[PDB]
């Protein structure tokens, strides 16, 4: 997964 800001 991705968490944060992209």
Pull the structure tokens for residue 3.
Answer: 């968490």
Pull the structure tokens for residue 4.
Answer: 């944060």
The 3-class secondary structure across 1-6, one letter per residue, is CCCCCC
Method used to solve the structure: electron diffraction
Structural gaps in the chain: residues followed by a C–N separation over 2.5 Å: none
The DSSP call for residue 4 is: S
The terminus-to-terminus CA distance of the chain in angstroms comes to 12
Place of tokens 């991705």: 2
With b for 16 or more beta-carbon neighbours within 10 A and e for fewer, the 1-6 pattern comes to: eeeeee
Pull the structure tokens for residue 1.
Answer: 């997964």
Pull the structure tokens for residue 2.
Answer: 């991705």
Chain centroid to CA 5: how far?
Answer: 5
Pull the structure tokens for residue 6.
Answer: 């992209």
């Amino acid at each position: 997964s991705y968490s944060g800001y992209s």
